[PDB]
Amino acid sequence: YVEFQEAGSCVQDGQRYNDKDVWKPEPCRICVCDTGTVLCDDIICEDVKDCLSPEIPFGECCPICPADLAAAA
């Protein structure tokens, strides 16, 4: 109930993959069976640090603010 762990293998569309194994279902989103759990995280590409707020330009694979447009001193 409170997020329990069971079995290592991960079923992805009916495919048995390893935990340490990593599969990329989407070029904008990556998935991995970390700790036997399929943890999907957004695709964060290189960029600045301080910045302001994350924003995806039109349609990319990095829903963050890049380091080029609107840069600080």
From Swiss-Prot:
Tissues showing expression: Isoform 2 is highly expressed in juvenile chondrocyte and low in fetal chondrocyte.
Compartments where found: Secreted, Extracellular space, Extracellular matrix
Span of domain VWFC: 8-66
PTM characteristics: The N-telopeptide is covalently linked to the helical COL2 region of alpha 1(IX), alpha 2(IX) and alpha 3(IX) chain. The C-telopeptide is covalently linked to an another site in the helical region of alpha 3(IX) COL2. Contains mostly 4-hydroxyproline. Prolines at the third position of the tripeptide repeating unit (G-X-P) are 4-hydroxylated in some or all of the chains.
Domain notes: The C-terminal propeptide, also known as COLFI domain, have crucial roles in tissue growth and repair by controlling both the intracellular assembly of procollagen molecules and the extracellular assembly of collagen fibrils. It binds a calcium ion which is essential for its function.
Family: Belongs to the fibrillar collagen family.
Protein function: Type II collagen is specific for cartilaginous tissues. It is essential for the normal embryonic development of the skeleton, for linear growth and for the ability of cartilage to resist compressive forces.
Clinical disorder: Spondyloepiphyseal dysplasia congenital type: Disorder characterized by disproportionate short stature and pleiotropic involvement of the skeletal and ocular systems. Spondyloepiphyseal dysplasia, Stanescu type: An autosomal dominant spondyloepiphyseal dysplasia characterized by glycoproteins accumulation in chondrocytes. Clinical features include progressive joint contractures, premature degenerative joint disease particularly in the knee, hip and finger joints, and osseous distention of the metaphyseal ends of the phalanges causing swolling of interphalangeal joints of the hands.
Record text on subunit structure and interactions: Homotrimers of alpha 1(II) chains.
Protein's UniProt name: Collagen alpha-1(II) chain
The species this protein was found in: Homo sapiens
First-to-last residue of the parent protein present: 30 to 97 of 1487
